[PDB]
Curated annotation (Swiss-Prot), chains A, B:
Subunit structure, as described in the record: Homotetramer or heterotetramer of pore-forming glutamate receptor subunits. Tetramers may be formed by the dimerization of dimers. May interact with MPP4. Forms a ternary complex with GRIP1 and CSPG4. Interacts with ATAD1 in an ATP-dependent manner. ATAD1-catalyzed ATP hydrolysis disrupts binding to ATAD1 and to GRIP1 and leads to AMPAR complex disassembly. Interacts with GRIP2. Interacts with GRIP1. Interacts with NSF via its C-terminus. Interacts with CACNG2, PICK1 and GRIP2. Interacts with GRIA1 and SYNDIG1. Part of a complex containing GRIA2, NSF and NAPA and/or NAPB.
Residues shown, of full length: 414 to 795 of 883
Entry domain remark: The M4 transmembrane segment mediates tetramerization and is required for cell surface expression.
Protein's gene: Gria2
Organism field: Rattus norvegicus (Rat)
Protein name as catalogued: Glutamate receptor 2
Location in or out of the cell: Cell membrane; Postsynaptic cell membrane; Postsynaptic density membrane
Task of the protein: Ionotropic glutamate receptor that functions as a ligand-gated cation channel, gated by L-glutamate and glutamatergic agonists such as alpha-amino-3-hydroxy-5-methyl-4-isoxazolepropionic acid (AMPA), quisqualic acid, and kainic acid. L-glutamate acts as an excitatory neurotransmitter at many synapses in the central nervous system and plays an important role in fast excitatory synaptic transmission.
Length: 259, 259
């Protein structure tokens, strides 16, 4: 049957095309993950339908109810067959779903407004004049909440106690906060998003310092799914063919607006 | 029972300790992969024995006999339970063994003697005054042999036809050739090895340009092994704890000899 793909709108991975109202089906969407879903399906020989996760989440388990939300939840509970999105490969997700080998590398990174006198996480951690935070859901927040590393633990303590709230709900909100805060907000976000934004007008942000960790995004399937093996081999094939690098250049750099 | 680990001597992943003749068992060895094997075993709760692959290979299948050699072969044929080494995650290996999520990122990279007027693969590809090659076995050679990308295809054609042979048998041989060829040899090798060497005396090499691809090393087990799941979760746990970054710094940078 048609494979149900769950994904989520996030630039430049999945976006509704400007003229989407005139299109149908999968053709309504564009972006890195859209292109990737099409290549994976072509290599594994299946038809598929892109659907957008209802709750707008990636995947976390409620501590009380023990229910998985997000795209991971759609897989775990049988609502979707595959998740193709900037879904960070984490231990807690790997315990309940199957992940491909990573299709893209990333790490938590610092986005500043140009001119901000910050060069590293340790720099942020030692001060408060420049506020800093993360998405209020997702693997970045969890990284900090869970870290036993001294600098990241101090940052997490800072972020929980800082007022007003340093958390944002969306990547767009975080970028807007950076751009509007006159150098007094720094956003901690995945390096991929950071790099994407740095290439976009008004060219007033930049990624600074090293990344805080290293990890990858993977394609996820329900545990035991017969699709898993084929999609993993497809990811490795596409990587080896240079197609993943091509897609990254297409969506991040090829039409870069900032020099 | 005790888990049989197959690995291979390659610096700084696995090395015999200077006083190994006075030690026994796993304690004879040191390096990044030695440390990693110990952490994985501790997290998965097994005892293990480090053994060194007999044929000194990583893993490739003979086109005629269809027999797998190297550490991959030891797994496929039941001689070892787990392979812990700088074993590049490739499609052809993933078809016959199980790989963890990557424990370390890398890409094919160019090593030059300092002062060599080369900044990229495309630079090498356009000339012949500076000879360039790879290991005569391994994933780097296969990358070139198999590439359909124009620049890498031209490089492969160059390497097959260049005289004398541009291939080397070991990383040490490649480094020595770079250091001894007065800027007239460049070595194509994994970025991890390149970065390691760049930090060692006599500080006369360096990694130049971007990497030519992106990939990872993974821990490998025989297909269907019950160890697979646990070792994969261990790798993700160790990554998330910052232990993999710590090990890389330990073996590459902490005692760097070159500034
Ligand atoms: C943009 C969203 C909320 C995602 C994408 N990857 C991370 C994930 O899979 O949880 C989340 C980002 C983050 O936590 O900075
Ligand atoms: C050093 C050896 C021959 C290894 C390590 N990784 C690659 C592999 O797993 O094949 C080989 C290196 C290379 O091909 O440049």
């Amino acid at each position: 049957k048609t494979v149900v793909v769950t994904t989520i709108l996030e630039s430049p991975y999945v976006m509704m095309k400007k003229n989407h109202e005139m299109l149908e089906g999968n053709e309504r969407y564009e972006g890195y993950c859209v292109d990737l879903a099409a290549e994976i399906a072509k290599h594994c020989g299946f038809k598929y339908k892109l659907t957008i996760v209802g709750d707008g989440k990636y995947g976390a388990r409620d501590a009380d109810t023990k229910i998985w939300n997000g795209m991971v939840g759609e897989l775990v509970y049988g609502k979707a067959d595959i998740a193709i999105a900037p879904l960070t490969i984490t231990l807690v997700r790997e315990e309940v779903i199957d992940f491909s080998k990573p299709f893209m590398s990333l790490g938590i990174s610092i986005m500043i407004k140009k001119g901000t006198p910050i060069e590293s996480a340790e720099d942020l951690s030692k001060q408060t004049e420049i506020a800093y935070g993360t998405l209020d859901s997702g693997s970045t927040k969890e990284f900090f909440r869970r870290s036993k590393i001294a600098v990241f633990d101090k940052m997490w303590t800072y972020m929980r106690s800082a007022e007003p709230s340093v958390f944002v709900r969306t990547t767009a909100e975080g970028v807007a906060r950076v751009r509007k805060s006159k150098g007094k907000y720094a956003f901690l976000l995945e390096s991929t998003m950071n790099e994407y934004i740095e290439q976009r007008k008004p060219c007033d942000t930049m990624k600074v310092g090293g990344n805080l960790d290293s990890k990858g995004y993977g394609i996820a399937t329900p545990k035991g799914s017969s699709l898993g093996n084929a999609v993993n081999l497809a990811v490795l094939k596409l990587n080896e063919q240079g197609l993943l690098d091509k897609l990254k250049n297409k969506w991040w750099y090829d039409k870069g607006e900032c020099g």
